[PDB]
Design a protein around this ligand. Structure first.
Ligand SMILES: NC(=O)OC[C@@H]1N=C(N)N2CCC(O)(O)[C@@]23N=C(N)N[C@@H]13
Length: 812
């Protein structure tokens, strides 16, 4: 029935606005309640205690909020416009139609879902022109009763036109590789010359990343072009004459001690410019070093008296993280500078307006001054948007989201008030969208910014070059790793995660050093800059590579994905497979490799309508009938052998080893006992029906081996410690009676697969690391040889956001 959402207010003005929303905003079955506290930190505590449910935090406060004594988590935030947004016109049309208002602009889309080149605001009669991303072409807005601008289609991305400008007069210049939708691949390979280099979002080469053919190519990050960026700036009056390197001793006003635009961006610049004498957060609090840097200041929330001297709040509210302090916030910091209580104001660029351009200007970190409109060139760094937070337990996230989504639909005045600016939310907020429940402080801030916040609060870990922290995914692995650590002589330590993805995050966060990953997780890990140090070797026939490291191997023990049929017992070939059964929807050989080939050779729909048992593929489906159909042992057609039972029972895609298993009498069953290796064989493309013994040639694809990944700067140490530990323990080790790497009484396949022969150091080749790990057939088949084949919250956190006024640049 009726639920309630308790919003926390840090000030009297915020409670006045919040109570206005309680009266004027009617959301059915949700009741808004306003809880009052005296500061930002007291509101975070109230949410932690269950006294309130939601509040809005600056991005600079997200990291500290995620820890004791707050333990808060971002749930709702304003989305930015990226150059990777799909079906944007359709989504934007739905949102506008969802608004409970009449006469608002509703974007117009064609049949394909693209923007119509001309967009009109029906209620006002104004029309304008737009590119493929919906951005208004400058100057094309016309009122009713006036000749309209004629609108061209701007649908050709920047790269795709460069392909056919270089494809041309039989020249020899280079052609770029770009993923679908025309975006530049971050890694570029020159066809004529073995050179490799890397580009940003708009395809221009970054810098020192070009490499000759014989050398290892650079490790290069995915870039995204994002619009509307806000910046941290230092604002000063034109009357003053000092520059940035003369800030010491001056009077300053800051939006807040915990805010990026008021403190954290400034401290980063002061340290990099060597203007701030600071030993470090372990030796000295950053506030103490800053207290000696400035003479007197107003920095709301500060615990040094001189940093609170210039504040204007009445006693009990002076220097508080609250609008009760008149100088709090971006506009509060501007007010102090206006009233000559400080010589410089540190605030967000959103508080800049052309009205201030007469008296005010910007203080640039290169010791120059520039006008306000040059803030994109005169700033202390980008500031990501704030976010709504709640408890990590996330008990009331659903109720909080339903309220804000409904309040936005009903045009409630969330982002403005007569009482003041930036109350409850940033006034610049256009909309708030729900975040994935996977998102936390690390994923929201991103890998680079997270470490900057971690280092700034003195939680930065420095890994020991002589110890490897190994991440586990369950209690049994933790027990075996503890057994390993106790016999490692300080070389091995153990961390705990719930899944391999969590282990990858811990390595990126600096909380762990190494983990073994199956093939499914390698795409994200390699995308985030991790690298394989050692890999599981499974060739039980050859021991040369294990006994002596560096000696070559003939077969790494890889599985090969193949399609097994009987020899003309059935007359099937690859080209008439329409009208087979698979191990499982998630398995690589059973599903990933075949389905990737199918969709690649004729762009269509595999989900159904291509075949005439594939567990985990819904029910009442084309294949789920042949099996019920659960991705579980309880289905008798699940797994490697389960897919073998399907080939014999109404047979029409498995690893190569499965046929040799059960055959020749190996599996005691009523069905698969009296069949032999001459009865079955495999489908190759265009070749077909090799005697199942010609795999490695009659294969759909090879499957790369499991890899142990780590950071690039930890590669040499991890392999060194693993190699030393492998000589002691594991198969044929000096102290193998003390402990075993590839077997355990705690369980099976802990940390590594128990059938692993040994770990072999990864031989890196002068090739793309995605190709270098996966191999060209697997990389091309499964992921299209592209860095954009899959997207996720983890990959987004590992993606560099590159600011641009508009996406327009990608179209001309
Ligand atoms: N075939 C094979 O099994 O490869 C063994 C080992 N492991 C890989 N995942 N690779 C990726 C591709 C590759 O070149 O085959 C190899 N690449 C390097 N640096 N060592 C090889």
């Amino acid at each position: 029935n009726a639920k309630q959402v308790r919003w926390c207010a840090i000030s009297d003005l915020e409670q006045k606005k919040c109570n206005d929303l309680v009266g004027s905003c009617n959301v059915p079955d949700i009741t808004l309640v306003c809880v009052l506290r005296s500061s930002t930190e007291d509101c975070m505590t109230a949410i932690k205690d269950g006294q309130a449910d939601a509040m809005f935090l600056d991005s600079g406060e997200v990291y500290e909020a995620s820890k004791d004594p707050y333990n808060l988590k971002p749930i709702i935030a304003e989305p930015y416009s990226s150059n990777r947004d799909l079906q944007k016109c359709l989504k934007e049309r739905q949102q506008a139609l969802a608004k409970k208002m009449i006469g608002h602009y509703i974007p117009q889309c064609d049949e394909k879902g693209n923007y119509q080149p001309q967009q009109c605001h029906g209620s006002t009669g104004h029309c304008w022109c737009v590119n493929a991303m919906g951005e208004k072409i400058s100057g094309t807005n016309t009122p009713p009763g006036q000749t309209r601008a004629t609108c061209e289609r701007h649908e050709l991305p920047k790269c795709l036109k460069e392909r056919q400008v270089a494809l041309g007069k039989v020249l020899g210049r280079f052609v770029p590789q770009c993923d679908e939708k025309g975006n530049y691949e971050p890694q570029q390979f020159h066809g004529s010359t073995g050179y490799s280099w890397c580009v940003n979002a708009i395809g221009e080469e970054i810098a020192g990343t070009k490499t000759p053919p014989g050398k290892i190519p650079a490790t290069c990050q995915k870039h995204d072009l994002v619009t509307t960026c806000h910046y941290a700036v230092a604002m000063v009056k034109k009357s003053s004459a000092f520059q940035f390197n003369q800030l010491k001793g001056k009077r300053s006003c800051h939006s807040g001690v915990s805010k990026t635009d008021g403190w954290k961006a400034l401290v980063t610049v002061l340290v990099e410019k060597k203007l701030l004498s600071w030993d470090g957060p372990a030796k000295e609090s950053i506030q103490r070093a800053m207290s000696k840097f400035f003479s007197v200041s107003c920095i709301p929330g500060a615990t040094q008296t001189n940093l609170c001297k210039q504040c204007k709040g009445e006693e009990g509210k002076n220097c508080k993280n609250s609008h009760d302090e008149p100088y709090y916030g971006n506009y509060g910091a501007f007010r102090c500078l206006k009233e000559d209580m400080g010589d410089v104001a540190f605030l967000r660029s959103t508080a800049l307006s052309d009205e201030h351009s007469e008296v005010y200007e910007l203080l640039c970190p290169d010791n120059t001054r520039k006008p306000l409109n040059k803030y994109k060139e005169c700033n202390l760094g980008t500031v990501p948007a704030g976010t709504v937070v709640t408890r990590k337990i996330s008990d009331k996230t659903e109720d909080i989201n339903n309220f804000l989504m409904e309040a936005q639909k009903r045009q409630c005045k969330l982002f403005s008030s007569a009482h003041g600016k930036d109350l409850m939310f940033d006034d610049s907020t256009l909309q708030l969208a729900l975040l994935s429940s996977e998102v936390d402080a690390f994923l929201y801030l991103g890998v680079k910014l997270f470490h900057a916040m971690k280092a700034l609060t003195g939680d930065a870990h420095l890994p020991s070059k002589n110890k490897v922290r190994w991440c586990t995914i369950n209690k049994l692995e933790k027990m075996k790793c503890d057994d390993w650590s106790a016999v490692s002589g300080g070389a091995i330590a153990c961390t705990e995660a719930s899944c391999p993805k969590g282990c990858v995050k811990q390595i990126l966060k600096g909380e762990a050093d190494a983990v073994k990953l199956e093939v499914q997780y390698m795409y994200e890990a390699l995308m985030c800059g991790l690298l394989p140090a050692v890999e599981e070797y499974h060739n039980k026939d050859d021991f040369g590579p294990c006994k002596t490291p560096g000696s070559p191997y003939t077969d790494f023990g890889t599985l090969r994905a193949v399609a097994l049929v009987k020899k003309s017992n059935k007359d099937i070939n690859w080209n008439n497979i329409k009208g087979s059964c698979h191990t499982g929807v998630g398995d690589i050989a059973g599903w990933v490799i075949p389905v990737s080939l199918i969709r690649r050779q004729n762009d269509n729909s595999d989900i159904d309508s291509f075949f005439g048992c594939a567990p985990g593929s819904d029910t009442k489906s084309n294949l789920c009938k042949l099996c019920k159909c659960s991705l579980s042992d309880k289905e008798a057609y699940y797994g490697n052998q389960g897919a073998f039972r399907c080939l014999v029972e109404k047979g029409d895609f498995v690893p190569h080893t499965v046929v040799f298993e059960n055959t020749d009498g190996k599996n005691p069953a009523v069905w698969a006992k009296n069949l032999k290796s001459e009865d079955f064989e495999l489908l190759c493309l265009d070749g077909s029906r090799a005697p199942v013994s010609n795999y490695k040639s009659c294969k759909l694809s090879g499957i790369p081996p499991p890899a142990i990944v780590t950071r690039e700067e930890s590669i040499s140490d991890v392999v060194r410690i693993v190699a030393n530990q492998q000589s002691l323990y594991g198969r044929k080790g000096f102290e193998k009676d003390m402990f075993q790497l590839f077997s355990s009484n705690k369980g099976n396949n802990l940390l590594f697969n128990d059938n692993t022969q040994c770990l072999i150091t990864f031989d890196r080749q002068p090739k793309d690391i995605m190709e270098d790990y996966f191999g060209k057939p697997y990389y091309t088949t499964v992921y299209g040889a592209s860095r954009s084949a899959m997207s996720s919250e983890l990959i987004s956190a590992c993606t560099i956001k590159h600011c641009s006024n508009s996406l327009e640049v990608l179209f001309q």
